[PDB]
Amino acid sequence: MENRWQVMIVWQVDRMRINTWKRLVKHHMYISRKAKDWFYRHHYESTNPKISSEVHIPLGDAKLVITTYWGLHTGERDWHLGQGVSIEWRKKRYSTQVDPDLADQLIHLHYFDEQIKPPLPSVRKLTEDRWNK
Amino acid sequence: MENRWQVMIVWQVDRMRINTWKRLVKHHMYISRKAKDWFYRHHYESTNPKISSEVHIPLGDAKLVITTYWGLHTGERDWHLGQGVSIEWRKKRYSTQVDPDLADQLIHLHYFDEQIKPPLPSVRKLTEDRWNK
Amino acid sequence: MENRWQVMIVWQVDRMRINTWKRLVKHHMYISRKAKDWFYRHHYESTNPKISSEVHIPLGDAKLVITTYWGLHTGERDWHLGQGVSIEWRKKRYSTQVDPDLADQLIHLHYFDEQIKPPLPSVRKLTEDRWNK
Amino acid sequence: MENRWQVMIVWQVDRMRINTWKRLVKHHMYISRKAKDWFYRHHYESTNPKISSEVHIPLGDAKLVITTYWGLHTGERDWHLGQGVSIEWRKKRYSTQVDPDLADQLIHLHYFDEQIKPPLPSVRKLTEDRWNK
Amino acid sequence: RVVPDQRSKFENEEFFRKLSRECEIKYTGFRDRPHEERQARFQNACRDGRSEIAFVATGTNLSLQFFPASWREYVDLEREAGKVYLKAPMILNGVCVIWKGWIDLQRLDGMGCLEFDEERAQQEDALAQQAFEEARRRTR
Amino acid sequence: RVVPDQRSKFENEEFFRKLSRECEIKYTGFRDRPHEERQARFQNACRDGRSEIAFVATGTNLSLQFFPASWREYVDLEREAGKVYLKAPMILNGVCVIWKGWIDLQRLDGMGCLEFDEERAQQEDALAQQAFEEARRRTR
Amino acid sequence: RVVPDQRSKFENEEFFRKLSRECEIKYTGFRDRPHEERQARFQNACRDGRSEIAFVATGTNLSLQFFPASWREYVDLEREAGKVYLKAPMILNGVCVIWKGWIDLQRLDGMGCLEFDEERAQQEDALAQQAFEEARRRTR
Amino acid sequence: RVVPDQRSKFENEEFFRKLSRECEIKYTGFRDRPHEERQARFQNACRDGRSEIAFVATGTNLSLQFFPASWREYVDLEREAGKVYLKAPMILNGVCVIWKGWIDLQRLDGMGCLEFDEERAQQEDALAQQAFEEARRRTR
Amino acid sequence: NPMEAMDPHIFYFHFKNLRKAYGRNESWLCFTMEVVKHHSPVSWKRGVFRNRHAERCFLSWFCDDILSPNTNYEVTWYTSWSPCPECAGEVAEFLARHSNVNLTIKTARLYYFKDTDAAEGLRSLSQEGASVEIMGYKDFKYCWENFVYNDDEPFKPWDGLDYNFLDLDSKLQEILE
Amino acid sequence: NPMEAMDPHIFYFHFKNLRKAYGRNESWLCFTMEVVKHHSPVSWKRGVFRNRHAERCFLSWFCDDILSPNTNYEVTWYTSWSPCPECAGEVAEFLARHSNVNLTIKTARLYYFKDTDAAEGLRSLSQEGASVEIMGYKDFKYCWENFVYNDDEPFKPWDGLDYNFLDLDSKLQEILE
Amino acid sequence: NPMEAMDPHIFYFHFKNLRKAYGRNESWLCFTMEVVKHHSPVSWKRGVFRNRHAERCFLSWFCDDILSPNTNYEVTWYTSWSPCPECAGEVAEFLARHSNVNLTIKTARLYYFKDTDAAEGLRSLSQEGASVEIMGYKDFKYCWENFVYNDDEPFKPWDGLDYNFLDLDSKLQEILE
Amino acid sequence: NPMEAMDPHIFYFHFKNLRKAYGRNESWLCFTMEVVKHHSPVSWKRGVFRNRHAERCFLSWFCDDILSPNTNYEVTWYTSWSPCPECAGEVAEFLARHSNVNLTIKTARLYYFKDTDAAEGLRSLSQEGASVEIMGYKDFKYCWENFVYNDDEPFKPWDGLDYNFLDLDSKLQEILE
Ligand SMILES: [Zn+2]
Ligand SMILES: [Zn+2]
Ligand SMILES: [Zn+2]
Ligand SMILES: [Zn+2]
């Protein structure tokens, strides 16, 4: 027939909170180094054309990734204009995809042990829809 | 007759503690940024040929400088091989030269408000002679 | 009475040919290196507040400089809005200021010995007024 | 049984002409830019552990690569200490591996159209054994 | 128990509840285009490669994306005439759960729910399956 | 002619001559170690993965390297007892030529020569096969 | 001759002609402001420091700028009442030429011309004066 | 009091004590060279420019360096024959203290001590003199 | 990412329609993107892109910074080459999904690799609204006075662009029919 | 050189009018520069500068990129501090020369170094058109919705800015009289 | 690539044998490589590597710069961790091929991931000449006076390394038997 | 700071003693510095410097890294030019102060600016131990086999260096007498 269909559970989000995620992680990498071990690899190091930029965070033994999609398909609630995110923890070629409500608790196991200048990059702050609620 | 004789009270030191001062300040500037506002200007931005490198530290209103000398004259206690330091606080073209025992207390007014990884750059640790005592 | 009055013969020019001079010299320095030995020092390495940026060109024995002024005084022919240039060849603390029609012939003694992509930076192309003629 | 055996025709060479190939291509990329379109990708962008560094040269339509091996197996003529090279031209996922005597004639189709300071990077100069002849 | 208690996490873990609230799914595709043409574009996209398809959860900002495997799982028209069935497995919160559902090819309004997958739940792993319960069970 | 004239390049192109000068091959492996132990290490390396094997041309600085395909082609012991046969295809100067040869498992001194491959010479390509004769035939 | 022949360059070199075409000078200062107020601002700026003054050549894009020496030469009001005289030396094309001129303090329209300077023409240099005639006389 | 109480700091501040412990000074110059030649090199260096001279405190790692002013203060031979007197002012811990001392031109072993300077202690500053007592008096 | 303008010595190095232009792999474009936000005034965008290929680097800027619902966009490219046969396979799917963009590649030169892969690749790009044309003397000077540091000096043509127009135009009706 | 906007964790780090704000040497500004070209429509400029001091870095951008004759400009700064006593000695001479600029520093905080050098320095700046004010709740939210990546989330005040207004305003009529 | 020495605030951050040391992914080594060229005098090499993992970054420097035939080498590592289970799978094959290297990992700390993958991985490394040991007070001060900017100040021990020695040594005879 | 060696296409670009060599301002040197620490074995240093001028960049490396009391040093430069007349005014004062250095500029080319400022400048450099010579065929090949990536291929002379030697040597006894 044809090929198979590799799934990733992509949380569709806005245009704007993506461009505050790309400004907090780039804050907490270079000029402030609270969590500096996050290898933000760029565009054309990927094979999937709908990938903007992975955020490879090596979390102890193996890497959690947070990737950004663009131009998928238009959403239901009049702003979801084809740009989403699918968090994914891989363990030496064994891939799983995780809860956003647990992923920020999973950075919490390494970052960090403690009006904030600035707030820490939490993916739960990212993936909350400003239109359904 | 001839010109005048501009004095600076130069504390002569070894070869080695200079090259641990140049490794702690370069630690606390770039890769760690505990005190990142210290403009370490390089060699040929000076007019005095016996200057290695000034350490311009802007301390609130005006800049304290800490400069490094090389090849002055050989010392008395068999290691002081022509390399020294003269700390100097200038205030908008008004220059004074200060106690090392007070200068580390004068960085203390701005840096920092608190086995350490690493110890903070203190000039009193620099200027203590390892040969007279 | 008061101080003396250091003169430099400043050719006033437009806003636009300055910002094609800053794009040809920055072309012929970094990405193309036809004449790569031109040390373009930046803004706050100067003592005169009406200096934009010197172009130190070491021409064999000693350096020719080409400096850029901003906000001097408004000109006569309705575009000369306070931005000018004064070419100056110094020889080990002996300063002279030169003809633009000879200065491009003076870069010609070193650069270069030969629809062009791109044309070479010639100061005569800079200093020709587009309003008097 | 087991997997298949992907072949690449690897010309084994010395230690020294590798480290004059890595100094001529790095000469003709950055500081001189006679042939500047040669993307020298680094170590850990590869999946084969016996790869030092590919030299991706985009040659018009598709890329020729020249890769460097290290620690393969010791050679026959008392210097071939496990470091070799396999030139390979791929065309949109169609791979071939080429004559060194023709590959320098194949850079010649694009580079360059003309005691030299310095000589151009020719792979025939690389792959000639200094021990058999 | 290692497989039956994350079987029991589908009984208990409320993010598996929120995923499986028996909820509707909808193909939100070419929505600015009029309603009749897009079922053709949906039907053209389903069985060829080189394209993706979306499935919103109709209540949340969650979606299911079927990328081609060049970038079990099937998209097909051969089940019923004028209706497409969807099924695909995934590894969500470390455990193998399969997502399946139907969608009306004419309305583009359907129903889908993921149920826990027991068959290749022997094909999980030995200890690096538990590596997420070096994080899920092992909180710190 | 497109396949028979690069068949005729094996008749004519002298770099295919220099490759195929009926020449000897030799496993230059653990040469600093003594002569008896290395045939064990050769035999241990031949049929497992995770390793490479070398074959020098015994006159030149040319070698054949069998990387595992995770980084037609076979390395096997089952042909004769105490002797391994080698065969692998490649695409050398744009054309599909297969390399084959034998090597004595006790001496580690053998014989190998590559002959032009005609069977999957229909499996070449249509025009991007000729893309190397946009460079080989098309010189400039 | 080393001083009398660049004295003779003022006779001959036509860029010294173009500079000294007996031409008018004008203070182009606060030109967007009305005509009466700017003579005050001119008079306020002339004898204090911390400011510059301009003198256009009224035909070209050439100007004379009097920066303070903290960044022979005088700007003064004491010569005549309601009129300022200007004089300053410079080293133009390697040779010491002094620029002088008058400007009407009420009209801001005057006259200025540079004449060659002979007095400190002994104060030039010995050989690095000729270093510009390692470029002017020595063309290549 | 602003000048008499840092006059009183010379009475009290023990880093002015440690500087002024009536201590010996010595020209440590060309020490690897033999003892007789260096008094010539000292005498050659004293009255010309383009060079520095050192004066160690003979007990500490403190020294006094007389750079030329191109990089009150005098180095001279004209006081006594075969002996040089030294005097120079400085601004140490914000206050104007002058350093003076003698050194035997034949032994290169002498005596020097800095006393507080009262004459140009009116030439200090008005408030930015006190800017170091926005740090010395004002500790925090 | 959107470069504002360009110096004219690369304008002539890239946007001249001759047979000297086969010796590199780089591409350029100039857009002129006119937003129409409903019940709001018409704004403008303008700029130049270069090299990831260039006409996809438009879309990664397009779908990530400027884009907003309830709008209508009049995108107008000005490309040296045509879009590449893979580039058409990733831009034509965009305006398939977004029907509010009236994209218009009025390019300058056609594509050197004359094969089947670009024939229908420029055709399959075209049934969605992508009005492919060839830019001419009305548009080269429009690129001159809106994208080039042109000294505020008038446009310099090269004599022969009017008849480099037609024989390059004729290679569009060859593939569009 | 003109930075377009700013993230709100440095907006609160710099533009809060309290007594915690003495511990750095950096300054910020937000301009809102309205060109009036005669016989031509009114355009706009907008952006943020930081550190060469910041309010001179405006002028090196101002006199080198945007400026053009026969125009009228309504510059409107929004500064954390006041301009520095040397900075007033190099900005007040600018709009002395250019009378078409209606510059307006409606700043937020005054200057910590309370001395004579800034007293007439802010006065000598002011007789040319520089209408120095203090920005308030009408203007902090105007800085919020025009210069801050504000999540498209409404303005968060800190309670006390209305009475940090007046006692900082009273230090302007102290120096202006 | 071979860093010459190291400041002591990272010597204590990495080469202390405690249970605080689980909170990063970085590794260090100090080599002491003694060439023996035949009919030629004995030279020396010395230096520190860090992060591609570190003990492979030795070998890419080793097989590309220093190596030469007819030699004998006495390599002596001093590693924080053990080599990683994949790192043992790419260093043990090296000295399998080269029999002139008497490599010796007298490391400091063992490896936190206690599993089967490192058990025989350190064993399969060991039958070729790789004399794995644990460095002690004779060797920590040897690392101190040869790799550390130690002020020319004598060695500072932490009291407990002698009994952090034995219970970490006992985890080697556990895997080697 | 001490570069170890150099590729031969800049060896010929700088260290050839001809009349083509007037067209740059850069200088090179090769040192060969032999420490003699008392009651300790003789070590060695070796390397190349380039551009702050080059022969002062030796001394900033010399007086800051390697230097130590109770030693004797045999420094041996190999310079393209002579030291510059200002450079002689800052290197001759060094070995005036340090008498344990037997520095030896056996340079290759003389200096183009033939004036009085370099005549006694090379003389005043010379009464302290600085044995100025001209390097020859014994020393060009010594620079070849110790400083040049020479392919382990034998030395290539240019025919004429033996008589570029003497007429450049004769310009040393001209200034030394
Ligand atoms: Zn493209
Ligand atoms: Zn300021
Ligand atoms: Zn490792
Ligand atoms: Zn020099």
DSSP per-residue string spanning C110-122: TS-----SS----
Q: Which of K25, K27, K52, K115 would you mutate first to test chain A, the one with the most A CBs within 10 A?
A: K25
Query: Any idea which residue has 């204009």 for tokens?
Result: A81
Q: Which helix (H) or strand (E) holds B21?
A: helix B18-24
Q: Which helix (H) or strand (E) holds L124?
A: helix L116-124
Q: How many degrees, rounded to 5, is the angle at CA B31 between CA B27 and CA B35?
A: 60
Per CB-CB distance under 8 Å, the chain D contacts of F28 are 73-76, 80
Beta bridge partners, B65, equal B56, B88
Query: Any idea which residue has 């653990």 for tokens?
Result: F30
The string of DSSP codes covering F59-108 is SSSEEEEEEETT---EEEEEEETTEEEEEEEEEETTEEEEEEEEEETTT-
* Residue F8 burial (CB count, 10 A): 12
Peptide bond between residue A119 and the one before it cis (omega within 30 degrees of 0)? no
Give A86's DSSP letter: E
Per CB-CB distance under 8 Å, the chain B contacts of L59 are 71
Phi-psi region of C19 (alpha: psi -120 to 50; beta: other; left: phi over 0): alpha
CA-based nearest distance A113→chain E, Å: 10
Query: Any idea which residue has 């030529």 for tokens?
Result: F97
Of the partner residues I52, I60, I69, the one whose CB lies closest to the CB of residue A78: I69
Give A29's DSSP letter: I
> What is the rounded distance in angstroms from the CA atom of residue E24 to the CA atom of residue E108?
11
Annotated catalytic residue, options L34, L55, L93, L133: L55
> What is the rounded distance in angstroms from the CA atom of residue K131 to the CA atom of residue K102?
8
| Number of domains forming the structure of chain L | 1
| Cβ(F81)–Cβ(D59) below 8 Å | no
| Cβ(G12)–Cβ(G116) below 8 Å | no
The domain segmentation of chain B, as residue ranges, is 1-133
| Cβ(D92)–Cβ(F128) below 8 Å | yes
Q: How many degrees, rounded to 5, is the angle at CA B17 between CA B12 and CA B19?
A: 115
Q: How many degrees, rounded to 5, is the angle at CA D52 between CA D51 and CA D55?
A: 95
Of the partner residues B6, B75, B97, the one whose CB lies closest to the CB of residue H67: B6
Q: Which amino acid is it at J155?
A: F
> What is the rounded distance in angstroms from the CA atom of residue K100 to the CA atom of residue D108?
43
Identify which of F98, F75, F87 has the alpha carbon closest to the alpha carbon of residue F16. F98
Total residue length of chain G: 140
- Provide φ and ψ at H137, rounded to 5°: -70, -40
User: What burial letters (b/e) apply to G40-72, b meaning 16+ CB within 10 Å?
Assistant: ebbeebbeeeeebbbbbbbebbbbbbbbbeebe
Q: How many CA atoms lie within 13 A of J110 on its CB side?
A: 21
> What is the rounded distance in angstroms from the CA atom of residue F25 to the CA atom of residue B95?
81
Taking the Cβ of residue A117 and every Cβ of chain J, the question of whether any pair is shorter than 8 Å is answered with: yes
> What is the rounded distance in angstroms from the CA atom of residue I118 to the CA atom of residue H122?
88
Query: Any idea which residue has 């050197």 for tokens?
Result: I112
Are A and J touching by the rule of 3+ CB pairs within 8 Å?
yes
Q: Which chains touch D (3 or more CB pairs under 8 A)?
A: F, I, K, L
Domains, chain E = 1-140 (2.40.250.10)
Q: Is H73 helix (H, G, I), strand (E, B) or coil?
A: coil
Q: Which helix (H) or strand (E) holds L164?
A: helix L161-173
Ligand whose nearest atom lies closest to the CA of J49:
2
Of the partner residues E32, E41, E50, the one whose CB lies closest to the CB of residue I98: E32
Q: Extract the runs of DSSP E, i.e. beta strands, from chain J.
A: 29-37, 45-49, 71-74, 106-107, 133-134
Per CB-CB distance under 8 Å, the chain A contacts of J12 are 115, 117
> What is the rounded distance in angstroms from the CA atom of residue E56 to the CA atom of residue A80?
11
Identify which of C109, C118, C124, C115 has the alpha carbon closest to the alpha carbon of residue C66. C124
| Cβ(D127)–Cβ(D13) below 8 Å | yes
> What is the rounded distance in angstroms from the CA atom of residue A110 to the CA atom of residue A37?
11
| Cβ(F52)–Cβ(F66) below 8 Å | yes
> What is the rounded distance in angstroms from the CA atom of residue I43 to the CA atom of residue I52?
29
Residue E59 vs residues A9, A75, A132, E63, K120: alpha-carbon distances, Å: 15, 11, 7, 10, 53
- Cβ-in-10-Å burial (0-12, 13-18, 19+) of K63 comes to buried
Beta bridge partners, D83, equal D13
> What is the rounded distance in angstroms from the CA atom of residue K170 to the CA atom of residue I35?
73
The string of DSSP codes covering I14-33 is HS--SSSTTS-----EEEEE
Identify which of A12, H136, I153 has the alpha carbon closest to the alpha carbon of residue B106. H136
Resolution (angstroms) equals 3.9
Alpha-carbon Rg of chain C, whole angstroms?
15
Ligand whose nearest atom lies closest to the CA of J57:
2
Q: How many CA atoms lie within 13 A of B124 on its CB side?
A: 12
- Cβ-in-10-Å burial (0-12, 13-18, 19+) of E103 comes to buried
Of the partner residues E32, E50, E51, the one whose CB lies closest to the CB of residue I99: E32
Nearest chain K residue (CA) to B24? K7
Terminal C-alpha separation, chain I: 37
> What is the rounded distance in angstroms from the CA atom of residue L110 to the CA atom of residue L134?
9
The string of DSSP codes covering B70-131 is -SS-B-SSS--BSEEEEEEEESSS-EEE--HHHHHHHHTTTS-----SS----HHHHS--TT
Cβ of A6 and E29 within 8 Å? no
| Cβ(D56)–Cβ(D40) below 8 Å | yes
Annotated catalytic residue, options I34, I55, I90, I174: I55
Taking the Cβ of residue D32 and every Cβ of chain L, the question of whether any pair is shorter than 8 Å is answered with: no
Ligand whose nearest atom lies closest to the CA of K27:
3
Q: Are strands J106-107 and J133-134 parallel, antiparallel or unpaired?
A: parallel
Q: Which helix (H) or strand (E) holds A24?
A: helix A18-24
Q: Which chains touch J (3 or more CB pairs under 8 A)?
A: A, B, C, G
| Cβ(L8)–Cβ(L148) below 8 Å | yes
- The catalytic site residues of J sit at 55
> What is the rounded distance in angstroms from the CA atom of residue D69 to the CA atom of residue D18?
10
Q: In this structure, what token pair is assigned to residue D23?
A: 């100094």
> What is the rounded distance in angstroms from the CA atom of residue I33 to the CA atom of residue I104?
10
> What is the rounded distance in angstroms from the CA atom of residue F95 to the CA atom of residue B110?
73
| Cβ(L32)–Cβ(L76) below 8 Å | yes
* Residue J23 burial (CB count, 10 A): 8
> What is the rounded distance in angstroms from the CA atom of residue B58 to the CA atom of residue B39?
8
Residue K24 lies in domain: 1-177
Taking the Cβ of residue E51 and every Cβ of chain I, the question of whether any pair is shorter than 8 Å is answered with: yes
* Residue L145 burial (CB count, 10 A): 11
> What is the rounded distance in angstroms from the CA atom of residue K96 to the CA atom of residue K101?
10
Residue G105 vs residues G40, G42, J97, L2: alpha-carbon distances, Å: 9, 8, 19, 65
Q: Is L9 helix (H, G, I), strand (E, B) or coil?
A: helix
